[PDB]
Design a binder for this molecule. Structure first.
Ligand SMILES: C[C@H](C(=O)O)c1ccc2c(c1)[nH]c1ccc(Cl)cc12
Ligand SMILES: C[C@H](C(=O)O)c1ccc2c(c1)[nH]c1ccc(Cl)cc12
Lengths: 374, 374
């Protein structure tokens, strides 16, 4: 191989690749990036049985095509220390030479055949994502999912496609809260009417770094492959039977309250200075907040006026987990929210104000949460 | 006690105080700040046998004078969550009440008599620091000092006062490098012609957060007390016999080279991507840099043109520790530096370009460093 490339193009590609390297043992090919120069592109890949990324940059010049490997961390550390002007990469046996005016480096290459082949699938489902709504869903639902969950299928996000009705339902839960959205009018191409994919949390986080809009999502029910102009990503899927989220959602709610999002955030954060759980009291024209699990001589209280009166007689009391309630608020796009309740001992819902209205470049995420007793 | 205070004044004071609290065991008075309201001031202190801080803020109103205590971390966490408008602090038995419009808190106070008395000294030496030169010295020399040094007197910075000659010499070493400056024309008030104070590294770091200029420094040879308008700080001194730094500095240097500071930083950083130590080669019109301790198939090289020729025949070679050499450069205020050498196996000096010229609001820090053999 012998090429010249743009310093900034190469730095960028390498930063994205760092997440897919096992960097600690530099002696192992798991710390290296595979390189391949073909027809005016440098392809760079790092991969695994269960997750991987392939990218390319255009070569400024390309003189010798072929393949090789290089330690990814060291490569990125060298290139980040050079000026913003072309870099020459050239093999010299089982070594890669890096050159930029007076600065020169040599790093060892490993056998390129030891690199795992980058997998390709025959898709059973596919979509073109032309707007940010899916990543928006991903980002808003991610905090409810535990990556190190000892329960296998909850350690990822559900994507549930309905070809019939052109919907993609997206769901996360950790058993204490469950956040979901149903995306409308998605042109789904599928060999099945209804198909489901559970994506590991770790892949979800990597997707949020790589993709925003204008990408394809394709799955064979075993791997998902996500692709845009410069990147191909893949992940193993989690093995299956995601819980029936539809069965767990309440059918109706005794009470529905429209409440101020930012005033509830500030009030909850304030009380959480001394407690992880809060007693919320709703009256007609007031919301009161009190630390609940505080140490017994430590107390935080606040309140907020509700100008447009709630439909309450006396007072409804609800124990909440502060962090979870805030995360539910953080996932909302509106200035107000709706809190839907049944008994104080049963799960309650948090959603956007006017949640039926249809929005094209944002998802609308609802959260069901289990209350704290008392 | 019952006062009202400014939210921002109180937040600031509390942040500075966090460093002097043992925060993990909330049940111990070592996690609390002592409070005392006298004559339109709230005094806040946190202290130890060996280090401490006392601050004050003005009260907006003061109704009941007295004393109390409060958990410092919790207090700061509450106040950081309130609006930028007055806060009422009021005792209610062995509890402190905090109130701001609709928001109210209670925290437990401990017995104020269990708080250690804040020490006062009869000074043997004293100065008024009216400019940033001393903190500038502190900041530039601090990186060479190991706080967890198993050698007692090297775990701090030397301050060596000469009443006769109105100088304050300031020195740090970790045995591999030694950085020093001698500050001129300091009005020293002392009962001795020559006196020395070794300040612990930990106190040095706290001083850099609290003080800049317009402060007094006073010592009895056992504690140092540093004071400005709003703060009194103290520290135990380290017990003594700081090494004779003057004896360890070479008398003359065979070679002195004026070299480019920023070009040497970039070159060293670049080579340090693969190695902690570097081979520097100086020729007449070039400086060459090569990684030295790199893994044997990994190599970094660069060079820089020296336009105004050095006074060299063939080439001088010097092994350096990259991190130390950079820290020595970082401590300099000029665009160029002077590198003074004897044999490549002996210590070499790094100083500012034109180091004799006298500068009033910056210190000039020189660094002696032991080379790496080969
Ligand atoms: C079936 C699955 C499981 O038990 O792991 C499951 C997962 C999440 C929930 C649940 C049951 N039952 C629930 C009730 C309320 C909420 Cl917020 C979440 C859940
Ligand atoms: C006396 C003291 C010690 O041995 O601990 C000491 C401390 C620092 C140095 C030294 C001797 N001899 C040296 C030679 C060079 C340098 Cl940079 C520092 C030192």
């Amino acid at each position: 191989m012998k090429i010249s490339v743009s310093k900034n193009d190469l730095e960028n590609a390498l930063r994205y690749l760092q997440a897919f390297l096992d960097k600690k043992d530099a002696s192992s090919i798991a710390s290296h990036i595979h390189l391949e120069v073909i027809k005016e592109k440098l392809f760079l890949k790092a991969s695994d049985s269960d997750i991987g990324l392939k990218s390319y940059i255009f070569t400024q010049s390309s003189d010798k095509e072929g393949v090789g490997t290089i330690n990814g961390k060291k490569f990125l550390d060298i290139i980040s220390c050079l000026k913003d002007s072309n870099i020459i990469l050239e093999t010299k046996d089982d070594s890669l030479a890096i050159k930029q005016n007076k600065s020169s480096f040599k790093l060892p290459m490993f056998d390129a055949d030891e690199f795992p082949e980058f997998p390709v699938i025959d898709p059973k489902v596919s979509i073109e994502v032309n707007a940010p709504f899916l990543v928006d869903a991903f980002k808003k639902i991610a905090p409810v999912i535990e990556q190190t969950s000892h329960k296998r299928e909850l350690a990822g996000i559900l994507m549930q496609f309905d070809q019939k009705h052109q919907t993609l339902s997206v769901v996360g839960t950790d058993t204490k809260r469950l956040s979901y959205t149903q995306l409308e009018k998605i042109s789904i191409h599928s060999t099945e009417e209804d198909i489901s994919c559970i994506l590991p949390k770790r892949a979800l986080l990597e997707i949020l770094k790589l993709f925003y809009e204008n990408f394809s999502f394709k799955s064979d029910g075993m791997l998902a492959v996500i692709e845009n102009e410069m990147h191909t990503f893949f992940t193993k899927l989690i093995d299956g039977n995601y819980p029936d989220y539809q069965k767990i959602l309440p059918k109706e709610y005794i009470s529905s309250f429209t409440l101020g999002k930012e005033e509830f955030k500030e009030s909850i954060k304030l009380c959480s200075s001394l407690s992880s759980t809060i007693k919320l009291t709703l009256e007609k024209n007031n919301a009161l907040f009190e630390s609940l699990d505080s140490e017994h001589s430590e107390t935080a209280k606040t309140s907020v006026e509700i100008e447009k009166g709630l439909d309450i007689e006396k007072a409804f009391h609800l124990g909440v987990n502060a962090k979870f309630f805030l995360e539910a608020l953080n996932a909302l796009g509106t200035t107000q929210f709706v809190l839907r309740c049944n008994e104080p001992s049963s799960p309650f819902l948090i959603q956007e104000s006017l949640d039926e209205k249809q929005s094209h470049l944002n998802a609308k995420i609802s959260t069901l949460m289990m209350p704290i007793t008392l």
